[PDB]
Symmetry: C5
Subunit: 263 residues, 5 copies
C-alpha cells in the first residue's frame, strides 16, 4: 500500500478505542478463560491448559468511513491494573512473613492492523510436551532456535501459551510491540502505572498503524510471578501442589486515531 497524506484533524476525522484485556488461562483455541491466577502449575514435563498463561487478544471494530481513507493509530496509553499481594498469596512458614508474588515475569503489549506474528519454540524438546488444548510448535525435529524451520503462526486464537510463543521481529510490519521478560525463581515484580504517559506509534516517516481491515488488533500478556493459596504456607516442597501463576488483573489500552489516505 502507498501511504499518502493524513486528513486534517476534526471531530469527524479522529477516534479513540478503550479496552481492558483480561488475563487468559485458556482451555482451548475458542475458549479463553479469564482469571488472574492459573490453576496450580504442576511440575510435570507437560505445559497444561489452565495453568499456563496465554496471550490475550482483542480485535476492536472501528467505524466505517464514508485511493481510500483508513484509520491510523498514532499513539497509545497502556497501563497495568494490579494491587499489592501480601497474605492473598499465602505465607512463608520459614520466614514468618506473607509470601507475596514473586518469580519469572513477562510484560507485553502489541497494537497492530492485523494479528500478532509469533515464533513457537519448545525449549527442551527431548523432554517437554505441550498439552493438546494449547498451540505448540510443529513436530518436525527442528532445533530449539528461532531459525527458518521454527513454527510461525499468528495470534488469532485464545490458546497461545507465552511459555512457547515469542513475537516475530521478521514480520509484524504494521504493528508496534514491546516486551520485557524477567527470569529467576523468586524475582520480585515491579508494576508502575499512572494516567499521564503515552507512547507514540509512528515510525520514522510519521506513519502509525494503518487499520486496513477496519479494526485494531490488541494483544497482551502480563505474568507477574507465582503465588500460593491465601491462608496456606507456600514456597515449600510440602505445598508445591498449590503454587500458581499470577497475572495482572487487566491491561488497559487507549488508542488514538486519525485518518490517512492510502492507495
Amino acid at each position: 500500500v502507498e501511504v499518502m497524506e493524513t486528513v486534517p484533524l476534526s471531530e469527524d476525522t479522529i477516534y479513540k478505542v478503550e479496552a481492558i484485556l483480561l488475563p487468559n488461562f485458556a482451555s482451548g483455541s475458542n475458549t479463553a478463560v479469564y482469571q488472574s491466577r492459573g490453576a496450580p502449575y504442576t511440575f510435570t514435563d507437560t505445559l497444561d491448559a489452565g495453568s499456563s498463561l496465554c496471550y490475550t487478544l482483542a480485535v476492536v471494530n472501528l467505524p466505517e468511513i464514508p485511493t481510500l481513507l483508513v484509520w491510523e493509530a498514532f499513539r497509545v496509553e497502556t497501563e497495568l491494573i494490579f494491587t499489592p499481594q501480601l497474605g492473598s498469596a499465602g505465607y512463608i512458614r520459614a520466614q514468618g512473613t506473607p509470601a507475596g508474588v514473586e518469580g519469572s515475569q513477562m510484560y507485553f503489549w502489541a497494537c497492530g492492523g492485523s494479528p500478532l506474528d509469533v515464533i513457537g519454540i519448545n525449549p527442551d524438546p527431548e523432554r517437554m510436551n505441550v498439552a493438546a488444548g494449547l498451540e505448540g510448535p510443529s513436530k518436525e525435529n527442528q532445533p530449539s532456535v528461532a531459525g527458518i524451520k521454527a513454527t510461525r503462526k499468528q495470534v488469532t486464537a485464545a490458546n497461545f501459551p507465552i511459555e512457547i510463543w515469542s513475537a516475530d521481529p521478521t514480520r509484524n510490519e504494521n504493528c508496534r510491540y514491546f516486551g520485557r521478560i524477567v527470569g529467576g525463581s523468586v524475582t520480585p515484580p515491579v508494576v508502575s502505572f499512572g494516567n499521564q504517559s503515552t507512547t507514540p506509534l509512528v515510525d520514522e516517516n510519521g506513519v502509525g498503524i494503518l487499520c486496513l481491515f477496519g479494526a485494531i488488533y490488541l494483544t497482551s500478556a502480563d505474568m507477574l510471578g507465582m503465588v500460593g493459596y491465601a491462608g496456606n504456607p507456600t514456597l515449600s516442597d510440602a505445598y508445591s501442589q498449590q503454587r500458581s501463576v499470577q497475572a495482572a488483573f487487566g491491561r488497559f489500552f487507549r488508542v488514538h486515531f486519525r485518518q490517512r489516505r492510502v492507495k
Copy 2:
C-alpha cells in the same frame, strides 16, 4: 464542561495548598486510624481492619473566587517522609543483624477535582475474605479480573484497603495519579526524597485539574514493607504473630493553582 482561557497570573489569581496525608489502617468507614505500623498481620484467610493499609484521602477546600472562574491545579510537589529502620523493626536471629523494613510495597499518589475512582478485586475469592470493617468487592460471582463486572467505587472513606482497590484507568478523568507496586516477600524498599522536584498536572492541551467543586482531592498510599517489634526477633515462624505492615510517616503535597475560565 468547556475549557476556555487561563486568568492572567497575579497575587490574587494563584494559590497553593500544603498537606501531609497520614497513613491509615482504618477500623471502619468513618474511623481512620493514623499510625505508621499496622496491628500484626495475621496469616488467616481474611483481610482485617487495623492490619491492612488503606488509602488516605484529604479534601482541601479552596478560597471562594469573587462562564465561571475555577481554581486549576497545574503542578504538584509530593514527597515521602521516612527514616531508616534498623533495630526498631526487630532483629534476625539467624543472621545476627537488625531486621529493617522489607517486603512488598506500594507507592501511590493522586490529585483530582473529585474522589479517586477505583476497581475492587478479590485476588483469591474461593479462599479469601474481606472483614466487615473494610470495603470489599460485591459478591456477584464475578471473575478475579478488571472486567465489566468488577466492583467500581470512589475512595470517599477511610476503609479502602490497597490489597483490594486499584485506580481505575477507565475513569479518573479530572485527576492525575501515579503508582508503583513492588512484589516479593523480603524486597528492600527504596525511598528517595528532596525539595527540588515538581510534577506537572497539565494534559496535552495545557489543562490541569479543574476544581469544579471548590476543593482539591488528595489520595495516597505508601507501604514500605513489613517489620517486627523493636527488641524482638522477627522473620521466623516463632515470631510471625508480631509481623506488621510499615507505612511511610506521611506523604507531603504542595499543589499550585491558577484560575481557569470555564462554561458549564
Copy 3:
C-alpha cells in the same frame, strides 16, 4: 526579604566553600564523635548513643561584604558539588563462615545532604513508641502521646547539634524554605550499598526564579548523613547469632562539599 538582581560576577563577588563533613556517632550534644563505624549496635529496645548514626552539621562563616547595607548584599549559593569518600570493604568487615567469603558492608542505608541559609528543619518520630526508647544522650521526640506519623503533633526542631539520630529525625518538607536537600533511604537486612563518586558532577541550587540559597545569617549550613550498612570485626565471623554482639553501623568516611557563591541584592 524581597530578592533583587545578582551582582555582576568578578573576583571580588564570587566565593567558594570546601568542607568534608565527617561521620558522627555522638554520645551527647556538644561532642561529635568522628568515626566511620559505630559501637556495636545492640538489639535492645533503645536507640543508644555511640551505635546510632547522627546527622553531621557544619556552619561555615562567609566573608563580610564591604558596604553590604544600603538594599543589602548577601552571599547566594547557586550550585554545589558533593561526593562521598569510601573504599570497598572486604575482610575489614569480617567474614561469613557459612559462605566462606568476606562479609563486606550490607544492610539498610541512608544517603543525605542539605545546603541552607539556616539549620535543617526536621520532624522526629518514634517508629514503635510502645516498645522503643531513645537514649538520654540523643535528641528524641517529645513524649506527648502523639501517634507515630508526621502530623501537626509530631516533634519539630532544627538540627543544631551533634546528637540527632537519623533513625528518628527526617527532613521537614513543610519548612526548609531557604535550603535544598536530597535523601535516599534503602531498607532490607542485607542490602548491598552502591556509592558512585567523581569530580565532574555539580548540582544546581537555584529555584524556578533563579534564586539560590541566600545566606542571610552570614554562613552556609551544611548537613549530612551517610549510612552504608552493617559490618563485623576484621578477622572474625559475622552475620550470625553467635557474633551479633559485634555488628556495627558503617558510614562513609566523609562527605565532600564544594559550594559556589555569588552576591545577591535583597531588602
Copy 4:
C-alpha cells in the same frame, strides 16, 4: 581508505539486511551447532565443546554496485533484538522451594556489526587449573599472564568455536566495527530481556561515517547467554541434579541493518 561523500538517497542506493543469528554450542571449528540449551555443563577443570556457548557469526552478502574512486555500502544504523520466552517448568523445579526453577545465573548479551570479522582477545582466567577442550579455540600456551596485555592471544572470530568464557572483543582493534556487550555475574542472577520493534541504534562515528563494507558483505557476530537451567520435569539447583544443569541462550538475535552508499578511494 579515504572516505568521501555519501550518495544521494534513492531506492537504488539504499539496502537492508535482515538476519537472525542462532545460539551456537559448537563441537568444532567446522560446525556450528544450533541449539538454545547446551549439553550439561560439568564442573570439571575443562571447558567442554557442546556445553560452552560460542559466538555466532554470520557473513551476509550485499548486492554488487554498478575515476579512481569506488562506491561501497555503508551501514549507518541497526535494529537488534533478542527472541526469548519466559521459562518456568521447562527449566525444572526447585524442590526445597516448591516452585519452578526458571532461568538464572551469569549472563552475557553481545552484538557486533562490522566490515570484517570481530577482533577478540583470548584469556584463560585460571591457567594453573583450567583447560580448554581441543574442539574449542583457546589461548596460546605461551606462559602469558591472565590479563589483556601485549602477550595475550589475539584472533578474529571466523569460525564457530570461540567460547565466550575465553574470548572478549578487542578494543585496540575493531576499527570498522561497532559492538556492545554486557556481562552479569552471580550464581543465580535473574536475566532481564527487553525487546520491541521500535528501537534503532546508530552506527555512525563523530564524522558521520558508518561501517564501510569494503568486501561487499556485512559481518554480524553475537552471543546471548541468559543463565542456567535444569531438565523439564526434574529437580534442579541441587547437588543431586548438578549433572543436568545446562547453559540457556536466547532463541536468536535479530538484526536489521540499514545501508546507504559511500564514495571511497583506495
Copy 5:
C-alpha cells in the same frame, strides 16, 4: 597557569594515547604483579600483599611540541575526551561450583570500578576502616600511625598514587585535590553481589570543565590510574562459597581497562 586559546586542529596539533592498564596485586612498590585473580584472600586481621587489589598506574610521555615556548606563552597538550572500557568474559565453572546449589559459582561479591586521567598523579586519602583490629601488610602503602580517627579529616594520610602498592581497600580519591584530573568511581558492597560490566566501542567521555578546559599535561605526560574489582571466585573444578573451601577464595579483577585519550594543543601563559 593562565589558560588561553586552543591551537587550531590539524594533523600536527592533535594526538592520541592508547593503553590497557592491567590488574595489579603487587607485593611491593616497584614490582607490579599483573594477574586478574589475586592469591587466596585470607580472613585474618591483615590486608596482605598479593591478595589485595592495588591501583594500576601508567604514565605515558607525550611528544615534544616544536617551538612550545615562545614569548610569554607555552603550548601544552590538552586531553579533552577519553574512551575507556573494561575487558572481561563471563565466569561460570572457571570460578568453581556451589555444591549446595548444584551450579557454577561465577563471580560475585563487593566491587569497585574506577578510572582517572590527569596531568599529575592521583591524589588519595588512606584510611584504616577498623584501626583497633586491622593491619596493612608491610609491603603495601598504609595510613600513618598517628592515632587519627577512621574518617577523611585533616589528619587523614594524604599522598599520590606513584607506585604499584596502593591497595584499594585503603586508598580513596581525594576530592579536595585532583585539580587537573578527572576521575569516576563506583563501589558496590554485599558479600555475594553480582557484578555488571557494560562495554562497547561507541562511548566517549568529555574531560572538559565548565570553561571548556581539559587536562593540561604540564609535566609532559598523561597519568592514567584504574582499579576494577568485580567480586570473588573459587578455583576451577572445586567447590566454593563454603567454610570448607574458604582457603581458596580469591579476588577477581577485570582483565584490563582500555583507555584512548584524545589531545589537542592549548596555549597557556
